[PDB]
Design a protein around this nucleic acid. Sequence first.
RNA 1: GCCGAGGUGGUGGAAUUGGUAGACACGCUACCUUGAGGUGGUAGUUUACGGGUUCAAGUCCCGUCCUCGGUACCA
RNA 2: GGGGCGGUCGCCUCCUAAAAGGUAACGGAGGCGCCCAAAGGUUCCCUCAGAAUGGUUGGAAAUCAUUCGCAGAGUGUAAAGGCACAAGGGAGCUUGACUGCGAGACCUACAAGUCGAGCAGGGACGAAAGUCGGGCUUAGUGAUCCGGUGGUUCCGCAUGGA
Lengths: 82, 176, 50, 63, 120, 48
Amino acid sequence: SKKGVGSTKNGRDSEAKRLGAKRADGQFVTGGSILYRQRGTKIYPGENVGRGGDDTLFAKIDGTVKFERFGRDRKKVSVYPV
Amino acid sequence: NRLKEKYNKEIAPALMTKFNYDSVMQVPKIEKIVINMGVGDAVQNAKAIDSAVEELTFIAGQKPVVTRAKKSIAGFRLREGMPIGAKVTLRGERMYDFLDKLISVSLPRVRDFRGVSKKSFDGRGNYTLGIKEQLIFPEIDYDKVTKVRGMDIVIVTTANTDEEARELLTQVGMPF
Amino acid sequence: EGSVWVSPSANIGYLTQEVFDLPLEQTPEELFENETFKARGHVQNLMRHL
Amino acid sequence: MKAGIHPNFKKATVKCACGNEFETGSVKEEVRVEICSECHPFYTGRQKFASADGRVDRFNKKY
Amino acid sequence: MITKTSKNAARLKRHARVRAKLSGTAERPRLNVFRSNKHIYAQIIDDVNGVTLASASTLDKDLNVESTGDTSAATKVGELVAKRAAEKGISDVVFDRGGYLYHGRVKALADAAREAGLKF
Amino acid sequence: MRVNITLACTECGERNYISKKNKRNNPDRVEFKKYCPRDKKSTLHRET
RNA sequence: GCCGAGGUGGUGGAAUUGGUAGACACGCUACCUUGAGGUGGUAGUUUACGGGUUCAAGUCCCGUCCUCGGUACCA
RNA sequence: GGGGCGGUCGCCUCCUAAAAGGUAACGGAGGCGCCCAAAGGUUCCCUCAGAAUGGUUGGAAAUCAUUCGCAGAGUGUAAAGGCACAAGGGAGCUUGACUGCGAGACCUACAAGUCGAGCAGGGACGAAAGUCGGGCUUAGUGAUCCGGUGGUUCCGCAUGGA
């Protein structure tokens, strides 16, 4: 016996895009290097960090990276020099 | 001009010693008068907006705003925009002039006039006149009237409770 | 010169030879008297497209 | 105030057919009125004409 | 009821819009402006140290004016701002119009400081 | 419908730019001032 | 239950978004003609439903109900 | 989960997915093959939905004021993430929906894809600071070959052209 029903309708899925931390806390980091790939602003730019057009957080200068917090319930990437 | 002097001289000592305020600034003042129009045929009558852009400029020379709908309603066949209703806000000298027009000249011409309602206060100290015939004060001119669309007047005091706005508006001259 | 009598209560609808009687730069929306809803459609816009 | 938008306002010497005059500021320079407040009969207590007229029929037995 | 929020509440909000984009850094101190009814006030603030470096107000019994709330009072206090900013040599400064327009007494302050030699 | 638009220069006549526009919301020939690298300045361009 | 098809006036039924209680042929009603019927002549009655889109909806779209048929348990 | 039928073939979002990232199945849900000359840029402004009352025709619900509403609304569009210092709303002025680039990064077999401070040239808005290389981020698309069009101190089968 094999009675026919088909049509899953749910095959497809998009390609995994690699959001999240690309560099860590206390990591030495050159200029222009992507610190955080995200959608929206799960984490904000702080000192010496810029937010991109695809709202990635990248470092503007050389220096270590710190994920501090924006006070209430909110985070922040900031790059400091040595 | 005359209603300001009436208000100050007669009303402010009388109302101040009637409600026993702890300062001269607690005495309620009529701050603003908002004239709603509420023409909802802008959807169905595309010209009709000029009606009460024509009329409310003559009702008070401050031109009303052609105000827009802020939310789409499917039962009324209406998307966000397609502007609905006119609106005058009023503070200055023309407003005591406008209550001078209402109290002494207009409100006789309500063709079925009685005590306009005691129960038209919100519970905070503000009042609205619900008008059904748009010609009450003599400027409106039956000659220039086809659409009968009435009016909502919102007399807004600075009163903190309600019955002292009652005793304000009775003493200004609104009958009830 | 003489006498031209016509009915006072007759509604004479006139058509001209010359096309110089338009309230120009107006929309046909504002031109044609379309009162409410189907007055655009059932009266007017059907009458145009049809 | 915006210029060129609003119509004018002069000191309206509002009259009435009962002769009572009053002063406002309106679009009209002078306003003629047919019935003012002090002319309207509801404000003047129990009126003459309509209260003398509005007597319902006193069951006209008389004859 | 009808209640209105203060000038100061909306002014602090309209100032806090301004504050997201300029701060009192090193060698560009923040030149702040407060606009009382009876006086006008102007500080030159480091926001890294939290310290105002120079200051000038029309609440100064020395070098007084008559009207104190006029645009000329604002011009005199702006040249006093720049004069104290010349005595302690910052020489380059960033203008914080604080939640106002760039129109009247604030523009009089700013034009006076630009004339007297603060490079905005 | 949406159409691909070239925007040719007037001082140089060179094409240099493409963006899109409607044939209905912009039925007329559209013009902008952009940068002409042959002219090395801002120049009024023109749909062609 | 699944798939495919159609749901209009008493009837069968056309209508590519543009005026239909019905436009087309029958019934049906009122009258006329005739001794009285029939034929014949004159005039007359919301698109299965509910909610949109639209200036306009039978039509375009989302859901519900019914009927034809194919595809199953069982006899 | 034999083959055919049905269904699918590329791209985006969520869950599966096991608190980095990744991850399969004919697993569960959805979208895309665009739109916008303002729905872009900048400057200046400013705050939402509902409820309770007062209100003709106005209706349960248009528009009005009025208090309470740090968030349901709105965000062109699925869904996630995000947003009231606005990214959500207005108005003015505008074309940066620029040219040559680009230190350095993420991603990835490759082909590709994404982010990019800054520099110079020319501008827009702004008093200035500054911001602007499209939109709130991620979809809205396809190699090469062969042809078309436009331009070019390129070559051009001896030389000048073609």
